[PDB]
Amino acid sequence: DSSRRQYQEKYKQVEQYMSFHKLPPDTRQRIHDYYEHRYQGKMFDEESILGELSEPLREEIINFNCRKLVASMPLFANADPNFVTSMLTKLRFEVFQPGDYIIREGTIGKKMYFIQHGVVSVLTKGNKETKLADGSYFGEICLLTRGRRTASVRADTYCRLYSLSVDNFNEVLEEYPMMRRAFETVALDRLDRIGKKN
Amino acid sequence: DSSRRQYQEKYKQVEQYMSFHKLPPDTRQRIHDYYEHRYQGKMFDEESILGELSEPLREEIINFNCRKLVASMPLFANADPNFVTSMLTKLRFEVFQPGDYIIREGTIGKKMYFIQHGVVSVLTKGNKETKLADGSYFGEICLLTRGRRTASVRADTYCRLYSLSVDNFNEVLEEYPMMRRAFETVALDRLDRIGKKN
Amino acid sequence: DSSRRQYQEKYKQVEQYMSFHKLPPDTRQRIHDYYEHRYQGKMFDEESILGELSEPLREEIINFNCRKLVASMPLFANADPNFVTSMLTKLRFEVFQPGDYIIREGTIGKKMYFIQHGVVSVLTKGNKETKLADGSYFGEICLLTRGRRTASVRADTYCRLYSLSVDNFNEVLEEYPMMRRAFETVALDRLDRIGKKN
Amino acid sequence: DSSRRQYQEKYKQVEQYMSFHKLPPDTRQRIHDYYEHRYQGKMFDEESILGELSEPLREEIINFNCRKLVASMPLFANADPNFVTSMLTKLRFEVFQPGDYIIREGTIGKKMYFIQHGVVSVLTKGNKETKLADGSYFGEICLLTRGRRTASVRADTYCRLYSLSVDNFNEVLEEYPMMRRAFETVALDRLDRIGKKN
Numbered sequence: 001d002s003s004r005r006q007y008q009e010k011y012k013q014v015e016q017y018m019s020f021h022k023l024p025p026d027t028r029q030r031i032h033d034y035y036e037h038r039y040q041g042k043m044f045d046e047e048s049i050l051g052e053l054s055e056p057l058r059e060e061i062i063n064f065n066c067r068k069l070v071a072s073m074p075l076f077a078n079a080d081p082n083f084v085t086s087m088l089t090k091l092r093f094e095v096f097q098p099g100d101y102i103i104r105e106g107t108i109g110k111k112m113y114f115i116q117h118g119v120v121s122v123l124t125k126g127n128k129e130t131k132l133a134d135g136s137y138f139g140e141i142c143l144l145t146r147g148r149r150t151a152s153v154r155a156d157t158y159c160r161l162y163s164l165s166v167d168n169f170n171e172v173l174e175e176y177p178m179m180r181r182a183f184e185t186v187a188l189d190r191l192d193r194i195g196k197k198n
Numbered sequence: 199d200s201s202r203r204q205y206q207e208k209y210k211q212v213e214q215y216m217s218f219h220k221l222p223p224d225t226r227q228r229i230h231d232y233y234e235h236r237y238q239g240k241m242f243d244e245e246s247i248l249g250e251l252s253e254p255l256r257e258e259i260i261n262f263n264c265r266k267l268v269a270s271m272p273l274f275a276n277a278d279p280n281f282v283t284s285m286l287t288k289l290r291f292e293v294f295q296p297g298d299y300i301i302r303e304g305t306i307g308k309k310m311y312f313i314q315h316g317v318v319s320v321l322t323k324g325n326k327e328t329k330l331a332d333g334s335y336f337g338e339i340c341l342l343t344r345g346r347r348t349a350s351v352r353a354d355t356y357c358r359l360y361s362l363s364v365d366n367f368n369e370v371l372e373e374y375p376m377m378r379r380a381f382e383t384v385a386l387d388r389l390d391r392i393g394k395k396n
Numbered sequence: 397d398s399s400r401r402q403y404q405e406k407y408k409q410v411e412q413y414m415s416f417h418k419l420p421p422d423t424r425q426r427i428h429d430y431y432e433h434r435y436q437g438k439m440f441d442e443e444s445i446l447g448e449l450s451e452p453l454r455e456e457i458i459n460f461n462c463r464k465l466v467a468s469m470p471l472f473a474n475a476d477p478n479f480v481t482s483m484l485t486k487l488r489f490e491v492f493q494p495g496d497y498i499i500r501e502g503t504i505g506k507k508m509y510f511i512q513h514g515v516v517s518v519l520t521k522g523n524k525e526t527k528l529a530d531g532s533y534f535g536e537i538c539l540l541t542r543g544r545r546t547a548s549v550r551a552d553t554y555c556r557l558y559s560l561s562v563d564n565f566n567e568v569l570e571e572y573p574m575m576r577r578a579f580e581t582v583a584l585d586r587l588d589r590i591g592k593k594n
Numbered sequence: 595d596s597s598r599r600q601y602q603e604k605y606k607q608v609e610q611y612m613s614f615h616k617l618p619p620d621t622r623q624r625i626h627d628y629y630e631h632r633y634q635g636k637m638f639d640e641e642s643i644l645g646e647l648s649e650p651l652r653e654e655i656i657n658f659n660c661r662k663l664v665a666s667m668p669l670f671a672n673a674d675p676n677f678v679t680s681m682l683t684k685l686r687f688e689v690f691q692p693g694d695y696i697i698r699e700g701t702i703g704k705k706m707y708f709i710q711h712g713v714v715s716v717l718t719k720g721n722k723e724t725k726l727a728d729g730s731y732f733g734e735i736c737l738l739t740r741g742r743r744t745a746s747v748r749a750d751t752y753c754r755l756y757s758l759s760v761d762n763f764n765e766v767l768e769e770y771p772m773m774r775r776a777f778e779t780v781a782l783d784r785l786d787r788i789g790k791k792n
């Protein structure tokens with residue numbers, strides 16, 4: 001109940017932020033609904049709490065939190081738990097509201113994404129390529145080629161995603177060189193379909 | 199009303215800071231008036247609040263906050279919204295009181311500035327060169343030559359400025375190489391008028 | 397008594413974290429018992445408190461806190477107090493619960509550990525090699541070879557350990573080049589027993 | 595009066611820190627007296643307060659706080675105010691209690707010190723070389739040679755010092771190359787007296 005109060009006080013603080021900056025009506029609605037979807041009536045200082053815990057405890061916890069995502073994904077469910085735990089500890093939780101652009105085509109990608117829950121459209125030049133949903137990942141291509149985004153990725157629904165930076169991706173694959181190929185197969189496949197060796 | 203209280207408590211904390219360090223009369227006045235002009239009776243932990251929001255929400259917000267500045271400036275109003283949003287997300291809000299030196303001639307510039315509101319004198323050797331106001335930028339020269347300031351820039355009034363570091367400037371122009379020329383035209387023009395290829 | 401309250405409030409915050417993420421029964425028990433063993437009914441913002449103190453005061457304090465560990469260890473008890481204080485100021489306190497994996501074989505080691513109190517099994521390929529306890533260190537090998545872990549190290553009991561990063565290890569040994577050999581003797585000895593020049 | 599309360603609450607927090615870690619009698623006394631000498635019954639979040647202020651306001655403030663030190667020192671009192679303000683903004687306040695070792699001979703120096711108030715003994719091999727007091731600086735030698743401390747420096751009294759890191763020292767002297775010589779004259783002089791070109 002102090003974490004429900006936390007959320008309430010922090011929301012009243014947001015309300016005032018929005019009044020002061022005279023934020024427009026679509027963005028106040030969006031912010032209101034973002035708070036409810038992500039935090040759900042409670043707030044915690046996750047990284048403070050987790051900060052006070054031991055390494056193995058942070059890793060039981062994150063292994064539990066991403067339990068279903070792990071199982072969704074042959075890359076994880078079939079891998080050495082030490083590697084999954086390595087990658088998992090580097091993921092950042094992000095929520096996106098419907099219609100949001102996650103990745104914009106032709107930008108410099110420094111980030112990759114795994115879908116816990118949601119549907120995503122992959123788009124090039126305003127044209128639908130496929131959709132991706134729970135147990136898919138995207139944005140891997142730029143982590144490997146180290147160049148420009150080959151497609152746009154828009155949230156079609158609310159989306160619970162975990163992001164993984166380019167530096168964190170390489171640190172893990174240095175430690176687990178055998179895992180690199182699996183990403184490469186997927187990114188070659190996708191590069192075939194959209195017709196690129198740029 | 200908790201953000202008005204925040205400002206009040208933080209101001210009483212400032213008052214005590216000033217008594218303890220026996221701060222002189224011109225600087226207590228200045229500080230008093232700085233608080234009122236920048237914060238306006240309210241305080242928020244902007245970056246905490248924004249921190250809790252999604253990327254796209256931070257970008258609606260900053261696009262809204264710099265809405266008029268964008269429109270003031272052909273560099274922005276005529277550009278690809280993705281680039282404007284890129285640059286915008288890297289800007290830092292600074293306020294300067296009349297008579298303040300923003301840039302001192304012959305220093306190493308690591309920073310550039312866009313004027314939301316205010317008037318600025320550009321000066322060399324104690325001599326007025328021009329004034330700049332709402333919808334101008336300055337300090338771009340050192341971001342490009344990577345050397346010494348070619349003029350002083352003083353605030354003639356209260357000034358709402360957004361600063362952009364040299365590293366952030368280059369990160370964006372790497373992503374948007376086509377935007378570099380527009381800065382270069384302006385900085386060549388200005389280098390002509392004050393007679394430098396140093 | 398405000399530090400006992402601190403612990404209590406932060407524990408109620410943890411309880412709620414655990415309910416919200418529907419944490420499983422073995423991990424709630426573990427977390428409960430971790431809090432009691434590490435913090436003992438009190439919490440302090442150590443690094444805030446220490447932050448307000450002078451350097452020499454931080455160093456009396458840490459020299460006192462690791463007083464018995466120093467005396468346990470010929471590397472410290474026989475060394476120049478300036479070097480011990482150098483190393484000591486770089487140590488991080490970690491607690492591990494029984495059965496926890498401190499180091500996993502074949503990972504990239506960036507960290508070394510000194511035992512204040514506890515027993516540890518050193519393991520290769522699921523086979524017991526030795527145990528280490530109060531006044532031992534481990535993980536030094538990867539700090540010197542800059543490669544892969546040559547054994548697993550599991551906590552057999554509760555364990556009060558101090559960790560020392562690879563960068564911090566080298567910064568100190570640059571300042572105290574004469575101390576390098578002592579680690580090298582130990583790591584050569586251990587590399588002999590498990591049969592590696594990898 | 596909320597800053598006097600701040601100090602009181604933070605001191606009760608310290609008291610508990612000391613009881614819990616069963617800190618010894620000389621170090622509790624020292625800590626008690628350190629708090630009283632440095633903070634004087636009040637505490638402020640200086641860098642939070644200063645953080646909310648503009649650059650020019652931070653620089654009036656620090657120019658005022660180090661007003662007498664500036665005037666004490668030909669290096670400052672005779673220099674371009676822009677350079678003094680550059681250096682000043684990079685200084686960190688440190689207090690040392692009598693008998694404290696500020697610099698230990700033969701360590702790697704990354705830091706230099708200016709005396710606001712106090713007396714210091716400079717020592718080599720346990721032998722007094724000179725004393726330094728208000729308006730002196732020391733530790734400059736290692737900032738220039740980038741090697742080992744040529745003497746020990748002990749606080750003989752309470753000492754209000756401002757420290758300046760090696761990186762900050764070079765950043766300023768890059769911007770103000772003309773100021774380098776003045777340090778060099780002093781460090782050559784001192785290297786003569788203690789007989790070093792090491």
Ligand SMILES: Nc1ncnc2c1ncn2[C@@H]1O[C@@H]2COP(=O)(O)O[C@H]2[C@H]1O
Nearest residue numbers: 109138139140141142149150151190193
């Ligand atoms: N044909 C496709 N099918 C599924 N996903 C794709 C396809 N084309 C591109 N992507 C994803 O869209 C992402 C856009 O960012 P990247 O180019 O870094 O990596 C891309 C892939 O992860």
Ligand SMILES: Nc1ncnc2c1ncn2[C@@H]1O[C@@H]2COP(=O)(O)O[C@H]2[C@H]1O
Nearest residue numbers: 307336337338339340347348349388391
């Ligand atoms: N003649 C001018 N007209 C307008 N602005 C100028 C002129 N000369 C210099 N400036 C600006 O003053 C700034 C001082 O810092 P910079 O040299 O980095 O870049 C300079 C320009 O942005």
Ligand SMILES: Nc1ncnc2c1ncn2[C@@H]1O[C@@H]2COP(=O)(O)O[C@H]2[C@H]1O
Nearest residue numbers: 505534535536537538545546547586589
């Ligand atoms: N035979 C052994 N006896 C004691 N400790 C060992 C032995 N073999 C390995 N270790 C320790 O186990 C550690 C595993 O990590 P490192 O390879 O970095 O360094 C290793 C040593 O510190």
Ligand SMILES: Nc1ncnc2c1ncn2[C@@H]1O[C@@H]2COP(=O)(O)O[C@H]2[C@H]1O
Nearest residue numbers: 703732733734735736743744745784787
């Ligand atoms: N003879 C001396 N007189 C005054 N100060 C000295 C003398 N010798 C050394 N020092 C100072 O003592 C400092 C010890 O650290 P450094 O060698 O970096 O720089 C040294 C000088 O700042």
